[PDB]
Swiss-Prot record, chain A:
The active site is at E263 (proton donor/acceptor). It holds the Pfam family Peptidase_M32. Broad specificity carboxypetidase that releases amino acids sequentially from the C-terminus, including neutral, aromatic, polar and basic residues. Has lower activity with substrates ending with His or Trp. The gene is ypwA. A motif (HPF) lies at residues 231-233. Belongs to the peptidase M32 family. A motif (GXXQDXHW) lies at residues 399-406. Binds 1 zinc ion per subunit. It catalyses: Release of a C-terminal amino acid with broad specificity, except for -Pro. Residues 1-493 form the Peptidase M32 domain. Homodimer. This is Carboxypeptidase 1. It comes from the Bacteria.
Curated annotation (Swiss-Prot), chain B:
Gene3D superfamilies: 1.10.1370.30. The active site is at E262 (proton donor/acceptor). A motif (HEXXH) lies at residues 261-265. Belongs to the peptidase M32 family. This is Carboxypeptidase 1. It comes from Bacillus subtilis (strain 168). The gene is ypwA. Its EC number is 3.4.17.19.
Length: 497, 496
């Protein structure tokens, strides 16, 4: 089919602009000289609008139309690809190209601005951009339109189907189960010694471990690389180039470990999406939610599984000797999985983690129903952390400025971490049927069985299935919170109670 | 509105260049080998994207409309359009589909080249060197030429330079160098060069390179230093000119002169009139003029023994065991040693030109179809014997030595000699306004020298042509005499 090839040719063209775009973003987070900032933001905006144009072009629209009528004579991937392109057409089409362009430029600038604001713990430096980033999104919500809550317009950008109504009901149950559970954890003298955790752990050695764990867990270094960054992230330049980045803290080796493993999650996913889909519309994660189910599956359902540490603790002890000298493997894991309310989401424990997502969800729900101004955000932010965690951020760096998501314009994203955590919980239990020897594998430092399970259930499909079908097909039951609640509940009732 | 729409196309090209530059730089500093293929494609798409703007019909329309209206355009705009017209006319002779696959080939070929050099295996790079040469022979056809077919490629870098010109030009060089080296190779004055090949800790070298970069004027808020196989300097945008180097713990010289050399390109790129930023004119006047700046920094500063007066203290403290009880005097005497060798990039001042000539003739033979790919390693090793009296034992130190070809840079090499000549001329003339030059180096005060180079060379960007740059700066067109005298004198006082 000629029209088909002209269609995929265009996507593959977009594919290349994407690599250039992702590299520029990655380069900006790994050393790009500040003097080049302005032109760098300009170029990212140009190549982004290029992609935008190829997707909003009359020709693209004609190719879609034609291919829809001949829908039956086409293969599965082609059908899904055109339906996907059709939505992206109708969707972008609602936005003035001149606006998308300056927005993209603003994001590139806002993020560099943000990186500085956070490093200095300066809200006022970021504030100006935050106001615009939002002002743009409010406007975009108008252009796309919505059915219930205007915030759904943004939620739909990451989890098609997830609405404010659906989330309220679900975050309700999480509160109902986590908060009281976290109170019990707080009301006990079972607090495990964690003194050895906050000691000095030489950076150079943490770097060795992160690289090591990556190799161990299955991250392909021939198709990736590890580098340092203020805020860890994983990006896909092209199917053969999926990079991850982490952050080291000599007073908490944990941050790098779980951050690296977290990112390793996304990477593994990306490094296993069917190669046939490469260069196309469907070579991407099913949704942030399903993507986060992979990062969280690795970080939490492996990295935070005590058997995962049996074989590796020997190394950790040798990397920073004086610190873990005479610390029991048993004490070590108990120290790692210490649950207690803290300020940083990225570094929070498994039990208190969901609350962070909830806090962000609600603040955003407010920002887009015009209930809060940029000026009162820090105050609103701090209040929520008190309501759900009983602690109040004292600095901007550990407060509102903590995450990069807003700086990049990613509003409506955060809830996907919650969902992702739920998906991970559900995938984990169902995986036990096929791999009962799970904990045994971790102790043997054997991860291909687990990885393979995920590749066939999630990875490989890429965007050939939607989240709903991904989970129903893998566990044979739609997304159900009970699993996460049971996992968490059962796990933190034994460590403390 | 025409002039505006015109510069708007140029700025549009400028952002594609950053993207391309970055993709290139990234592929030389870490990019995963599995994204190798698609990386080539993206460079190709983005490169062809720039090509299409320069060859578009609307661009040609804007070109003509501004020419009619010429006399009313500004000096910058005039030159901007003259350049746009040259590239339009030049690129229009090449089939788009072909430039695209050619760009993709260079990207893939350079990747294959890094590996071939690493494994010292020519067979791995041969399949590519075959295609690169083919495309270009074919390009000579499209562009056309007058005297020698190689003239079409030489024109890509040094407009106005031809085989006739270079033959005569190099002829005088061989004549002055060859006998001069015999002498140096024939004297019991061989400076002691034992402490050089000692072990110099890589991590320490890196500190020095960063130190010298700061000293010589490189702006780190506008750039960065990173490692690579083959050092180079690139401009992503006016405020992002990066430089790379290569550390050898068994000869610190490689990283030092390598960095300072790249610093030259950078100090230049970082001083082109900002007004030309985002345009057609914000670049080097030509490869020769660029190599004139890198070579001025590398040789006329780095190799002027006075340069080491203020820094020799640091070199000793970085690797104390190595330079323990070695006189500053003996140091500079060893640094500027002159013995025939295999690697151009590391070759000494006296023998450097011979390396360029060897490549000049080889390339000349290549495009006049007087040699096949299969026979190049042979011919190459022969010339290295013909001019240096030594034969490469591995293709790594032989024909795989430099990257240029893998990158599709044929007709580029001569520009190093022209730059070296330009440097020699700029130098002697600079002595007129700066006699205390050697005094400045002893104090490590370079601002006087940089500012001179900036007013005479950098600031202009592409506003002036090389012929214009040199005439305006020295008062006379280019002249080999300055380089011959400089080398003649300098290396006669060392050994003879
Ligand atoms: Cl990021
Ligand atoms: Cl981002
Ligand atoms: Cl194994
Ligand atoms: Cl290169
Ligand atoms: Cl002296
Ligand atoms: Cl190159
Ligand atoms: Cl002197
Ligand atoms: F890098
Ligand atoms: Zn994540
Ligand atoms: Zn970002
Ligand atoms: Zn295995
Ligand atoms: Zn150079
Ligand atoms: Zn002297
Ligand atoms: Zn290159
Ligand atoms: Zn002197």
């Amino acid at each position: 089919h000629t029209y088909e090839k002209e269609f995929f040719d265009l996507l593959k063209r977009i594919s290349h602009y994407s690599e250039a775009v992702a590299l520029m973003h990655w380069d900006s987070r790994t050393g790009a000289p500040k003097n080049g900032s302005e032109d760098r933001a300009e170029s990212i905006g140009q190549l982004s609008t290029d992609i935008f144009n190829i997707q909003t072009s009359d020709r693209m629209k004609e190719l879609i139309d034609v291919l829809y009528e001949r829908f039956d004579d086409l293969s599965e991937d082609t059908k899904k690809a055109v339906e996907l392109a059709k939505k992206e057409y109708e969707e972008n089409k609602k936005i003035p190209e001149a606006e998308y362009k300056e927005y993209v430029i603003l994001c590139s600038k806002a993020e560099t601005a943000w990186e500085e604001a956070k490093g200095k713990s300066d809200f006022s430096l970021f504030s100006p951009y935050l106001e615009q980033l939002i002002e743009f999104n409010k406007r975009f919500i108008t252009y796309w339109g919505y059915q219930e809550h205007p915030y759904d317009a943004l939620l739909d950008l990451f989890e098609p189907g997830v609405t404010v109504k659906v989330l309220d009901q679900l975050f309700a149950e999480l509160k109902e189960a986590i908060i009281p559970l976290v109170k019990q954890v707080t009301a006990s003298g079972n607090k495990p010694d964690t003194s050895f955790i906050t000691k000095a752990f030489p950076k150079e050695k943490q770097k060795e471990l992160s690289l090591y764990f990556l190799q161990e867990l299955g991250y392909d270094f021939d198709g990736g690389r590890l580098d340092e960054t203020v805020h860890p992230f994983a990006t896909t330049l092209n199917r053969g180039d999926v990079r991850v980045t982490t952050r080291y803290d000599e007073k908490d080796f944990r941050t790098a470990i779980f951050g690296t493993i977290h990112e390793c999650g996304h990477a593994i996913y990306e490094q296993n999406i069917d190669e046939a889909l490469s260069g196309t519309n469907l070579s991407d994660g099913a949704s942030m939610g399903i993507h986060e189910s992979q990062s969280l599956f690795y970080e939490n359902f492996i990295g935070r599984n005590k058997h995962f540490w049996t074989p590796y603790y020997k190394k950790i002890q040798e990397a920073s000797p004086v610190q873990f000298k005479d610390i029991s493997l048993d004490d070590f894991v108990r120290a790692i999985n210490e649950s207690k309310p803290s300020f940083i989401r990225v570094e929070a424990d498994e039990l208190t983690y969901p609350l962070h997502i909830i806090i962000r969800y609600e603040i955003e729900k407010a920002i887009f129903s015009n209930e809060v101004s940029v000026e009162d955000l820090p105050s609103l932010w701090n209040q929520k952390y008190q309501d759900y965690l009983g602690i109040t951020p004292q600095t901007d760096a550990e407060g509102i400025l903590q995450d990069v998501h807003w700086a990049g314009g990613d509003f409506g994203y955060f809830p996907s971490y919650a969902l992702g955590y739920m998906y991970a919980a559900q995938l984990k239990q169902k995986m036990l049927e096929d791999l009962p020897e799970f904990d045994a594998l971790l102790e043997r430092g054997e991860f291909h069985p687990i990885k393979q399970w995920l590749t066939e259930k999630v990875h490989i499909h890429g965007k050939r299935k939607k989240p709903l079908d991904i989970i129903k097909d893998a566990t044979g039951e739609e997304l159900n919170v009970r699993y996460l609640i049971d996992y968490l509940s059962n796990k933190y009732s034994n460590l403390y109670l």
